[PDB]
Amino acid sequence: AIGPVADLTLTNAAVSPDGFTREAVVVNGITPAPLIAGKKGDRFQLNVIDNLTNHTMLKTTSIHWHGFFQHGTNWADGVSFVNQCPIASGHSFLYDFQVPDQAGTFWYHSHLSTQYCDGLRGPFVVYDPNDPQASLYDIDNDDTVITLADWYHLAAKVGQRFPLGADATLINGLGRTPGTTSADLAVIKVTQGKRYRFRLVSLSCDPNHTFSIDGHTMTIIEADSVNTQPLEVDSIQIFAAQRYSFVLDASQPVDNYWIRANPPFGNVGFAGGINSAILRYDGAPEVEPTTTQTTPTKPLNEADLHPLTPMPVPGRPEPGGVDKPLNMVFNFNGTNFFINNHSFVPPSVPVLLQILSGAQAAQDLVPEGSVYVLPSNASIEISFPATANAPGSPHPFHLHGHTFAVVRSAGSSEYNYDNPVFRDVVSTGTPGDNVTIRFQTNNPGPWFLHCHIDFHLDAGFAVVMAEDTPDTASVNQVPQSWSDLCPIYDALDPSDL
Ligand SMILES: *[C@@H]1O[C@H](CO)[C@@H](O[C@@H]2O[C@H](CO)[C@@H](O[C@@H]3O[C@H](CO[C@H]4O[C@H](CO)[C@@H](O)[C@H](O[C@H]5O[C@H](CO)[C@@H](O)[C@H](O)[C@@H]5O)[C@@H]4O)[C@@H](O)[C@H](O[C@@H]4O[C@H](CO)[C@@H](O)[C@H](O)[C@@H]4O)[C@@H]3O)[C@H](O)[C@H]2NC(C)=O)[C@H](O)[C@H]1NC(C)=O
Ligand SMILES: *[C@@H]1O[C@H](CO)[C@@H](O[C@@H]2O[C@H](CO)[C@@H](O[C@@H]3O[C@H](CO)[C@@H](O)[C@H](O[C@H]4O[C@H](CO)[C@@H](O)[C@H](O)[C@@H]4O)[C@@H]3O)[C@H](O)[C@H]2NC(C)=O)[C@H](O)[C@H]1NC(C)=O
Ligand SMILES: [O-][O-]
Ligand SMILES: [Cu+2]
Numbered sequence: 001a002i003g004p005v006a007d008l009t010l011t012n013a014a015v016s017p018d019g020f021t022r023e024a025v026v027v028n029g030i031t032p033a034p035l036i037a038g039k040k041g042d043r044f045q046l047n048v049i050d051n052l053t054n055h056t057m058l059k060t061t062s063i064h065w066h067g068f069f070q071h072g073t074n075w076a077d078g079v080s081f082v083n084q085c086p087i088a089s090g091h092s093f094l095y096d097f098q099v100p101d102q103a104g105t106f107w108y109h110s111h112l113s114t115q116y117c118d119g120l121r122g123p124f125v126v127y128d129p130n131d132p133q134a135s136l137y138d139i140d141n142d143d144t145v146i147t148l149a150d151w152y153h154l155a156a157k158v159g160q161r162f163p164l165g166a167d168a169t170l171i172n173g174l175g176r177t178p179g180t181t182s183a184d185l186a187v188i189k190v191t192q193g194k195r196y197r198f199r200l201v202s203l204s205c206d207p208n209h210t211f212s213i214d215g216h217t218m219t220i221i222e223a224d225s226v227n228t229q230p231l232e233v234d235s236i237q238i239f240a241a242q243r244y245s246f247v248l249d250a251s252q253p254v255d256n257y258w259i260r261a262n263p264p265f266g267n268v269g270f271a272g273g274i275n276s277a278i279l280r281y282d283g284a285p286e287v288e289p290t291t292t293q294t295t296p297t298k299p300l301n302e303a304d305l306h307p308l309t310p311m312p313v314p315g316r317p318e319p320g321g322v323d324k325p326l327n328m329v330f331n332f333n334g335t336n337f338f339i340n341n342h343s344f345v346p347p348s349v350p351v352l353l354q355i356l357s358g359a360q361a362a363q364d365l366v367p368e369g370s371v372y373v374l375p376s377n378a379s380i381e382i383s384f385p386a387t388a389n390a391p392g393s394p395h396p397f398h399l400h401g402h403t404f405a406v407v408r409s410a411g412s413s414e415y416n417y418d419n420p421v422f423r424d425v426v427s428t429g430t431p432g433d434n435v436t437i438r439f440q441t442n443n444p445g446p447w448f449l450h451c452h453i454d455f456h457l458d459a460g461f462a463v464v465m466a467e468d469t470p471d472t473a474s475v476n477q478v479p480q481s482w483s484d485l486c487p488i489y490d491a492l493d494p495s496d497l
């Protein structure tokens with residue numbers, strides 16, 4: 001795997017991951033983008049080189065490193081017009097950050113418009129040389145990463161605004177459509193008698209996926225970047241941008257077994273081997289599995305996940321019991337999503353730059369209603385009440401700059417102020433849920449908060465949490481090339497975007 005120091009060269013290319021050629025945004029020649037790897041304590045120097053030529057999929061770009069805190073490097077967080085202006089084609093930009101206090105399973109993706117959908121999305125793993133879970137498995141390497149990607153035959157700008165689901169689901173970059181039921185499937189090799197730490201990464205743009213492996217169970221040991229107490233399951237519903245590590249014990253008979261990743265909409269089920277890949281034991285014939293689906297008897301619920309090392313819930317054990325409660329009221333006008341009456345529109349001057357220039361109060365920050373200012377070292381609680389008014393539910397909400405406690409999950413009326421799982425992406429459920437989260441403001445800067453369905457994000461389903469605006473300038477020392485981005489971008493012709 002490349003990294004922790006590396007060149008990420010962006011180009012446009014024809015790809016056919018599911019048997020059908022279309023143009024894509026690729027990274028060092030491939031989509032999904034390649035695995036970036038390093039270890040706890042590393043310094044990542046990822047030099048993004050923009051050589052994109054296709055305006056329809058955007059020649060400009062910006063890259064987010066999903067799940068990293070970026071403490072004191074808010075400039076590198078990637079999010080376009082919040083954290084930087086876009087990189088222009090013909091240019092480079094070095095993302096330079098440290099990961100001193102974090103390990104686990106992450107990913108990276110374009111954070112401009114719906115560009116990540118057109119192919120700029122890949123896995124990112126930070127290994128812990130003293131992983132507390134290491135005794136549970138034998139093998140954890142580049143070949144134990146499993147990615148899932150909803151794949152479209154029409155490009156994101158050319159297609160529907162809220163598309164009717166994917167054409168294919170890609171498992172490790174490969175899969176089938178109804179029209180291409182003899183395209184190559186991905187194969188994941190195992191050896192009988194060994195235990196694998198599989199790191200499952202959703203690169204999804206919209207649908208969630210219900211993931212299983214015939215004949216096998218999965219012992220979950222990590223949710224997003226957070227180590228969990230081991231939880232054995234046999235089906236996982238993974239929402240856009242979520243991750244899980246799970247241990248698979250490869251001690252079934254030597255055979256081919258179907259790996260299944262069924263989306264809630266699009267092309268559903270398994271006809272012709274769609275939404276499928278192959279788990280192949282060494283020595284088995286190199287042929288499709290003939291295993292059949294078993295009804296799950298131990299599906300994953302977020303309520304059953306708890307952290308491995310105790311992770312104390314900020315604030316006090318009762319609703320609204322924190323320095324700053326917020327409630328996020330979703331709505332939708334048929335075109336744009338709205339949070340507390342406002343649809344995020346990206347500003348010309350990035351929010352960070354606004355703050356550096358001296359804008360530190362919510363009323364002086366543009367766009368007016370979308371930016372909330374938070375005091376430092378303060379406990380926060382945010383509730384995301386699902387509503388008939390925000391269609392496309394369940395919406396998986398993501399907070400940059402933080403992992404957070406999920407005190408109330410989707411499908412639960414219970415509040416857990418004691419030992420809830422922490423993570424960075426959480427499903428806000430269906431009408432009747434009031435999914436609720438907590439975190440401490442210990443990370444000065446402006447951090448995006450949004451639905452990770454990329455079509456909803458591009459339609460304004462976002463706000464910005466500008467924490468500690470007074471110390472934001474001094475804590476986030478900016479490099480000259482970051483300063484150079486906006487003049488270069490603002491100089492561009494509309495057709496060169
Ligand atoms: C920069 O990047 C962009 C984005 O990736 C690249 O865009 C590609 O642009 C080309 C055209 O320039 C485009 O091909 C065209 O696609 C349209 C749309 O197709 C859909 O239309 C219907 C959807 O509801 C549906 O009927 C249709 O289905 C059928 O299409 C063909 C049938 O033979 C089959 O392949 C397919 O399986 C299915 O049966 C599509 O889903 C299409 O209409 C175009 O064909 C046109 O037909 C009209 C009809 O009257 C004619 O008037 C036109 O003369 C024309 O023949 C054509 O196929 C790609 O779809 C775009 N790619 C993506 C991923 O969106 C762009 O190329 C790139 N630039 C460079 C320089 O590389
Ligand atoms: C999802 O969860 C959120 C967070 O819990 C929830 O928002 C909160 O709702 C409660 C009540 O529904 C709000 O609490 C109010 O606080 C003020 C006090 O300043 C008052 O309006 C109320 O206090 C009392 O009023 C009467 C006393 O005269 C009593 O008879 C009454 O019982 C109250 O105790 C009330 O407590 C709280 O302000 C919000 N938090 C926000 C908006 O940030 C939200 O409603 C939930 N959404 C869904 C759809 O379930
Ligand atoms: O994070 O998008
Ligand atoms: Cu993300």
Ligand SMILES: [Cu+2]
Nearest residue numbers: 066067398400
């Ligand atoms: Cu993120």
Ligand SMILES: [Cu+2]
Nearest residue numbers: 395451453456
């Ligand atoms: Cu959404």
Ligand SMILES: [Cu+2]
Nearest residue numbers: 079398400448
């Ligand atoms: Cu984001």
